[PDB]
Structure 1
Amino acid sequence: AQNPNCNIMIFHPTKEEFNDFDKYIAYMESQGAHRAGLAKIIPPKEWKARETYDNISEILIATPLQQVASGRAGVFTQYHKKKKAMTVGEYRHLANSKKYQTPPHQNFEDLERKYWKNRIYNSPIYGADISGSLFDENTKQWNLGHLGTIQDLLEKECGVVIEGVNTPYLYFGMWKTTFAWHTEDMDLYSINYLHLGEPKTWYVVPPEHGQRLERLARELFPGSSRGCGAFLRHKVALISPTVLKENGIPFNRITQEAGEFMVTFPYGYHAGFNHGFNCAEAINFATPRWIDYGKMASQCSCGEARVTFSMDAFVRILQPERYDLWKRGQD
């Protein structure tokens, strides 16, 4: 078995290997990459996502989210308070302000220590889930707006034709902006490209050990667990590396820099934070190996997680028993 310790693998495809997306994903899995739940892909040196970022300040963040924490430094939840709209230019200037900017630090490790010590005491503002793309239409390789769609994958593998579309989303971050512990909707893959700015630190639990993280989360967030049998789908809970180590949960960490892709694999729980002002683009995708994970994916039916139009069909086809109850939650 390849990669039996479930380490995060880093890939360096040549320009030739960067032509066929599906094939390269299947290659990385042949080497065991998926066992970690997360992989990094460094593009060939010839490749670029677009020519410059010189003209992005006019993108609108219609509903910036202030991420307010509650709890203790290593075990907390966050709620998102909606703020008034602002442009990317306005947000970048806010991120760089004295109140929100990255503090002085020695290296990524010192900054990681400062994040876990001090996150809860601040409320950074995140522009998340903004439909759109920053890839130039002429970028033909690994263009996250030109991938094969999940609906077409399900049709190719299973024969069934379904409604729905699959488009990318932009994320504008600042120091301390935080992504809570989660897997993807329907335990899909994700791919995330860091277009510009400061790094993103990731934490991930191997898919084969995901239920260990779930059991710890039920112990650490006991009222949330009583409320919903899949409350990590709410994307609100944080648990630090120190707390994971104290509780024996297997995990790995890695820092993504501008110009790099990350892939998350089905049922790979992940969380993380941004180091400073940045912009990322991400989208879900599927392969043949995902289908079985999609059939088994948990679902939030308490009504909090409230998700896309396209998830309907996935539930209806892959989880017809749950259909009914999940759509009671979704209405």
Structure 2
Amino acid sequence: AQNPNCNIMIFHPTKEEFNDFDKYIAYMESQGAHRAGLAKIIPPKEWKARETYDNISEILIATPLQQVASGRAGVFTQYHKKKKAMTVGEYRHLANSKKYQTPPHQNFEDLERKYWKNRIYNSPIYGADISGSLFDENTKQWNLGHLGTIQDLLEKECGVVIEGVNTPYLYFGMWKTTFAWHTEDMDLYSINYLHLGEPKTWYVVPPEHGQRLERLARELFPGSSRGCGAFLRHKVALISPTVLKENGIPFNRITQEAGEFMVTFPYGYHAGFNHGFNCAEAINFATPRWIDYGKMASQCSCGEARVTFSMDAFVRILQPERYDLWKRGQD
């Protein structure tokens, strides 16, 4: 078995190898990359997502989210308070303010320490889940707005034709902005490109060990656990590396820098934080190996996680028994 310790792998494709996305994902899996739950892909030196970022300040963040934490430093939840709309220009200025900017630090490790020590005492503002793309339409390789769609993958593999579309989303982050422990909707893959700015640190649990994370989370958030049989779908719970180590949960960490792609694999729990002002683009995708994960994916039926028009059809076809009670939570 390749990569038996489930280490995060880093790949450096040539421009020639960067021409066939599906084939490269299959290559990475042949090398055991999926066992980690997360892989880094450094694009060929000749590749660019776009010519410049010089005119992005006019993008609107219609509902910036203030991430308010409750709990203790290593075990907390966050809630998103909606704020008034602001432009990317306005948001960047806020990120750079004395109140919100990245603190002095020695290196990524000192900054990680400061994050876990201090996150709960601040409420950073996140411009998340903004439909759009920053790839130039002439970028032909690894353009997240030109990928084959999940609906077309299900059609090719299973023969069924369903409604729905699949488009990317932009994320504008600042120091301490946080993504809680989650897998993707329907345990899909995701791909994330860090277009610009300061890094993003990721933590990931190997898919083969995901249930160990779930069991810990039920112990650490016991009322959440009673309210919903899949509450990590709410994307509110954080657990520090220290806590994971104290409880024997296998995990890995890696820092993504501007210009790099990350891939999350089916049922790879992941969480992380941003080091400073940045802009990422991400989208979910499928391969044939995903289909069995989609059939087995947990769902939130308490009604909190409340998910997309396109996810309806996935549940309908892959989880017909659930269909019924799941759409009761979504209607």
CA deviation digits over 1:286-316, x for unaligned, max 9?
A: 0000000000000000000001100000000
Whole-angstrom distance in 2 between the partners of 1:173 and 1:319: 35
2:15 & 2:84 partners in 1: Cα distance?
Answer: 43
Give a deviation string over 1:169-199, Cα, whole Å, max 9, x none.
0000000000000000000000000000000
How far apart in 1 are the matches of 2:177 and 2:309? 27
Counterpart-to-counterpart distance in 1, 2:52 and 2:106:
29
State the partner residue of 1:72. Answer: 72
Shift >4 Å, 4+ stretches: none
In 1, Cα distance between equivalents of 2:164 and 2:88: 29
1:136 partner SS: coil
Q: How big is each residue's C-alpha offset from its partner over 1:262-309, in whole Å with a ceiling of 9 and x where there is no partner?
A: 000000000000000000000000000000000000000000000110
**CA–CA distance in 2 between the matches of 1:308 and 1:54?**
32
The alpha-carbon deviation at position 61 of structure 1 amounts to 0.1
How far residue 13 of structure 1 moved from its aligned partner, in angstroms, is: 0.1
**Equivalence for 2:29:** 29
Q: TM-score by structure 1 length?
A: 1.00
Q: Distance in 2 between matches of 1:78 and 1:38?
A: 23
TM-score by length of 2: 1.00
Distance 1:23 1:148 in 2: 13
Partner of 1:145: 145
SS of the equivalent of 1:190 reads strand
1:230 alignment counterpart:
230
Q: Secondary structure at the match of 1:153?
A: helix
Structure 1 residue matching 2:307: 3-state secondary structure? coil
* Matches of 1:301 and 1:126, distance apart in 2: 26
Q: Distance in 2 between matches of 1:308 and 1:98?
A: 37
Listed as ranges, the gaps of 5+ residues in structure 2 are none
* Distance apart, 1:215 and its partner CA: 0.1
C-alpha distance after superposition, 1:101-135 (max 9, x if no partner): 00000000000000000000000000000000000
- Residue by residue, what CA displacement relative to the aligned partner does 1:63-119 show, whole Å, maximum 9, x if unpaired? 000000000000000000000000000000000000000000000000000000000
C-alpha deviation, 1:19, in angstroms? 0.1
1:204 aligns with 2:204: yes
Question: What is the rounded CA distance, in whole Å, between the counterparts of 2:169 and 2:61 in structure 1?
Answer: 12
Q: Which runs of 5+ in 1 are unaligned?
A: none
Q: 1:134 & 1:306 partners in 2: Cα distance? A: 27
Deviation, 1:239, is 0.1
